Amino acid sequence: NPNQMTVTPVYNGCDSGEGPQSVRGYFDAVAGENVKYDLTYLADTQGFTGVQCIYIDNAENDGAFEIDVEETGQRIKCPAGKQGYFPLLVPGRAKFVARHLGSGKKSVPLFFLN
């Protein structure tokens, strides 16, 4: 009742184990990042570096936090507002790209650098 409303969850702020995560590339289709992380995982800020690919960097938070990550150019340190339920969305607007994202388990650099 009394909608619309939104209710969100986040691991932003606590860190029971520091960690790093790696890999991922694509060209014209929608790329998906599914996390199955019950044994070794944490939710963290992500760092997206676009190197020679100067198409858009795309960041998709899950259904609980609808963050649109806007990127163009050289990389930076970003803080996602992730959902506690696991999710990952990614999209690149350029063709034939290297995405080398950094999934951080630990609260992170809140700015953007070239």
Binding site: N1, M5, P9, K36, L39, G63
Partner: protein
């Protein structure tokens, strides 16, 4: 006597016995209640995500979500036909958060629907066909969808989903106490839209409702939902206030799904169980690059423990036979089910366990969509 171990076993038994007694008393003394929480009619072209706010009352067992829709095929000449999941794809995702903002279930409409069927022991809310001359049958169209929607037409589909908190009507494990002022309940429903509901010929039909040569010109006219909240009303009161099964109400029960890739012909593809959870059931959907086959692309399926020891390594038809004993029919093409209700998969009880699929054929973009039903208790 009995020493240390025996202390902890005795405690476990006093706790288990106390729980069961409390459950029995709640069931005999209380009162059920199922009441509408919210209804809305909309065009998914305008909005497809809704955050429903359940009422905070007593112990919450779950939500029955009624979903109706009208779809029009405006293609000049071509029809569309239901996909294997059809109306089960009217809801793309469902996520529930309790008053402490702890997330419980977070899964797809199709996975939730398959679990609803597994728990019923037959296709969920279906009407069985019999020779009875008395006119029983599909009278009320509880779950229903026109097979096709022609260019220029509007169809009315109906679908129901039960979003569980409590495991069942008698096992509250999973029930919700909605006796903590402050802490409210959150039910997010993400519905299908024109992009997800219609698949062109040759496209992957996994998340779609209809597929066919007329897909590009199909549009929802509207979708409507009504959420009913379920409740065990008139709780019994005793000298300590409400008589409540404390273990039941502080234990969770969730459904979740994920996608795994990396399959290659004749090689065992192993999906490890993400250890600590007590896995009650596992659903594996072999999305073979958009193709869904009736077992012909699989050599065998199995559940294996750290040892290389298989507890049920079966050819596809025999695997299907076990499922026919559970739901009186087969799940749709490429959908495989495994019941572990009486002895939940629980690593730390017997090493790492994995769900295994050894594929006979592997197309491009092949993957296994895994759906789990599990408890995650005091530990």
């Amino acid at each position: 006597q009995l020493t240390p171990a025996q202390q902890a076993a005795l405690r476990n038994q006093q706790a288990m016995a106390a729980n069961l007694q409390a459950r029995q008393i709640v069931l005999q003394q209380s009162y059920p209640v199922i009441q509408q929480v919210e209804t809305q009619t909309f065009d998914p072209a305008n909005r497809s995500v809704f955050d429903v706010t359940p009422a905070n009352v007593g112990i919450v067992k779950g939500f029955l979500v009624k979903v109706t829709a009208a779809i029009t095929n405006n293609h000049a000449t071509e029809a569309v036909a239901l996909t294997d999941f059809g109306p089960a794809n009217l809801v793309q995702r469902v996520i529930y958060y309790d008053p402490d903002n702890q997330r419980h279930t977070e899964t797809s409409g199709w996975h939730l629907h398959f679990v609803n069927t597994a728990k019923q022991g037959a296709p969920f809310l279906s009407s069985m066909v019999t020779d009875s001359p008395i006119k029983y049958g599909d009278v009320m169209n509880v779950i229903d969808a026109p097979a096709t929607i022609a260019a220029g037409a509007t169809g009315e589909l109906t679908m129901y989903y039960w979003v569980p908190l409590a495991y069942s009507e008698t096992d509250l494990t999973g029930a919700v106490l909605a006796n903590v002022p402050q802490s409210k309940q959150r039910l997010k429903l993400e519905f299908a839209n024109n992009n997800t509901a219609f698949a062109a010929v040759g496209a992957n039909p996994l998340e779609a409702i209809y597929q066919g040569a007329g897909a590009a010109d199909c549009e929802f006219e509207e979708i409507s939902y009504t959420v009913y909240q379920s409740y065990l009303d008139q709780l019994p009161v005793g000298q300590n206030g409400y008589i409540l099964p404390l273990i039941d109400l502080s234990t969770l029960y969730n459904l979740e799904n994920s996608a795994q890739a990396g399959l290659t012909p004749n090689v065992d593809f192993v999906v490890q169980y993400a250890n600590l959870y007590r896995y009650l059931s596992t659903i594996a959907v072999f999305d073979n690059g958009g193709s869904f086959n009736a077992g012909t692309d699989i050599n065998y399926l199995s559940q294996r423990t750290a040892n290389f020891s298989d507890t049920r390594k079966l050819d596809p038809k025999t695997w299907a036979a076990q499922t026919r004993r559970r739901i009186a029919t087969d799940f749709p093409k490429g959908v495989y089910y495994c019941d572990n209700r009486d002895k939940p998969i629980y690593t730390l009880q017997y090493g790492n366990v994995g769900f295994v699929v050894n594929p006979k054929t592997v197309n491009q973009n092949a993957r296994l969509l895994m759906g789990y039903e599990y408890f995650t208790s005091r530990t």
